[PDB]
mmCIF file of all heavy atoms in Angstrom:
data_model
loop_
_atom_site.group_PDB
_atom_site.id
_atom_site.type_symbol
_atom_site.label_atom_id
_atom_site.label_comp_id
_atom_site.label_asym_id
_atom_site.label_seq_id
_atom_site.Cartn_x
_atom_site.Cartn_y
_atom_site.Cartn_z
ATOM 1 N N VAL A 457 -54.065 -11.684 4.182
ATOM 2 C CA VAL A 457 -53.625 -12.531 3.095
ATOM 3 C C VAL A 457 -54.886 -12.593 2.178
ATOM 4 O O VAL A 457 -55.977 -12.803 2.589
ATOM 5 C CB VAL A 457 -53.209 -13.956 3.527
ATOM 6 C CG1 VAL A 457 -53.228 -14.852 2.316
ATOM 7 C CG2 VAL A 457 -51.829 -13.845 4.129
ATOM 8 N N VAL A 458 -54.678 -12.412 0.873
ATOM 9 C CA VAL A 458 -55.716 -12.465 -0.076
ATOM 10 C C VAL A 458 -55.391 -13.567 -1.166
ATOM 11 O O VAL A 458 -54.209 -13.543 -1.734
ATOM 12 C CB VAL A 458 -55.938 -11.119 -0.817
ATOM 13 C CG1 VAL A 458 -56.933 -11.279 -1.991
ATOM 14 C CG2 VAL A 458 -56.345 -10.101 0.180
ATOM 15 N N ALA A 459 -56.294 -14.514 -1.329
ATOM 16 C CA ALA A 459 -56.045 -15.569 -2.348
ATOM 17 C C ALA A 459 -57.185 -15.640 -3.370
ATOM 18 O O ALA A 459 -58.352 -15.559 -2.953
ATOM 19 C CB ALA A 459 -55.944 -17.009 -1.601
ATOM 20 N N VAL A 460 -56.820 -15.640 -4.591
ATOM 21 C CA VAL A 460 -57.880 -15.601 -5.662
ATOM 22 C C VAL A 460 -57.559 -16.669 -6.622
ATOM 23 O O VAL A 460 -56.406 -17.023 -6.901
ATOM 24 C CB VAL A 460 -57.968 -14.203 -6.373
ATOM 25 C CG1 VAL A 460 -58.267 -13.127 -5.338
ATOM 26 C CG2 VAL A 460 -56.629 -13.874 -7.031
ATOM 27 N N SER A 461 -58.552 -17.183 -7.320
ATOM 28 C CA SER A 461 -58.408 -18.100 -8.447
ATOM 29 C C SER A 461 -59.561 -17.940 -9.374
ATOM 30 O O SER A 461 -60.651 -17.817 -9.035
ATOM 31 C CB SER A 461 -58.370 -19.550 -7.967
ATOM 32 O OG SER A 461 -57.845 -20.400 -8.900
ATOM 33 N N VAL A 462 -59.155 -17.959 -10.730
ATOM 34 C CA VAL A 462 -60.119 -17.802 -11.798
ATOM 35 C C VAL A 462 -59.984 -19.017 -12.683
ATOM 36 O O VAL A 462 -58.899 -19.250 -13.239
ATOM 37 C CB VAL A 462 -59.941 -16.491 -12.655
ATOM 38 C CG1 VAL A 462 -60.817 -16.410 -13.795
ATOM 39 C CG2 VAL A 462 -60.088 -15.293 -11.709
ATOM 40 N N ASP A 463 -60.911 -19.792 -12.754
ATOM 41 C CA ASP A 463 -60.940 -21.154 -13.435
ATOM 42 C C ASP A 463 -61.432 -20.985 -14.879
ATOM 43 O O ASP A 463 -62.492 -20.560 -15.026
ATOM 44 C CB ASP A 463 -61.666 -22.096 -12.631
ATOM 45 C CG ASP A 463 -61.411 -23.551 -13.045
ATOM 46 O OD1 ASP A 463 -60.379 -23.795 -13.653
ATOM 47 O OD2 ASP A 463 -62.276 -24.464 -12.840
ATOM 48 N N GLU A 464 -60.525 -21.437 -15.700
ATOM 49 C CA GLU A 464 -60.844 -21.438 -17.218
ATOM 50 C C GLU A 464 -61.346 -20.092 -17.818
ATOM 51 O O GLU A 464 -62.443 -20.005 -18.308
ATOM 52 C CB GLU A 464 -61.772 -22.546 -17.509
ATOM 53 C CG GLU A 464 -61.269 -23.913 -17.105
ATOM 54 C CD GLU A 464 -62.099 -25.127 -17.598
ATOM 55 O OE1 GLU A 464 -62.962 -24.848 -18.510
ATOM 56 O OE2 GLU A 464 -61.956 -26.143 -17.049
ATOM 57 N N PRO A 465 -60.587 -19.035 -17.594
ATOM 58 C CA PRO A 465 -60.913 -17.753 -18.387
ATOM 59 C C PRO A 465 -60.818 -17.977 -19.832
ATOM 60 O O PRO A 465 -59.975 -18.764 -20.319
ATOM 61 C CB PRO A 465 -59.837 -16.762 -17.823
ATOM 62 C CG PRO A 465 -58.685 -17.626 -17.576
ATOM 63 C CD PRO A 465 -59.258 -18.941 -17.063
ATOM 64 N N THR A 466 -61.661 -17.229 -20.626
ATOM 65 C CA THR A 466 -61.612 -17.267 -22.043
ATOM 66 C C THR A 466 -61.593 -15.986 -22.643
ATOM 67 O O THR A 466 -61.196 -14.976 -22.027
ATOM 68 C CB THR A 466 -62.824 -18.077 -22.577
ATOM 69 O OG1 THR A 466 -64.054 -17.436 -22.269
ATOM 70 C CG2 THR A 466 -62.913 -19.474 -21.978
ATOM 71 N N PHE A 467 -53.299 -13.150 -19.822
ATOM 72 C CA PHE A 467 -53.033 -14.539 -19.433
ATOM 73 C C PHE A 467 -52.561 -14.586 -18.077
ATOM 74 O O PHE A 467 -51.740 -13.726 -17.617
ATOM 75 C CB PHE A 467 -52.031 -15.185 -20.383
ATOM 76 C CG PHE A 467 -51.682 -16.594 -19.991
ATOM 77 C CD1 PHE A 467 -52.387 -17.713 -20.459
ATOM 78 C CD2 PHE A 467 -50.624 -16.880 -19.196
ATOM 79 C CE1 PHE A 467 -52.103 -18.929 -20.076
ATOM 80 C CE2 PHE A 467 -50.244 -18.216 -18.765
ATOM 81 C CZ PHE A 467 -51.026 -19.183 -19.204
ATOM 82 N N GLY A 468 -52.988 -15.585 -17.252
ATOM 83 C CA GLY A 468 -52.422 -15.940 -15.931
ATOM 84 C C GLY A 468 -52.398 -14.791 -14.961
ATOM 85 O O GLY A 468 -53.447 -14.313 -14.531
#
Side-chain angles (χ1 to χ4, degrees):
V457 162
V458 175
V460 299
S461 195
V462 177
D463 193 20
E464 303 190 15
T466 66
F467 179 88

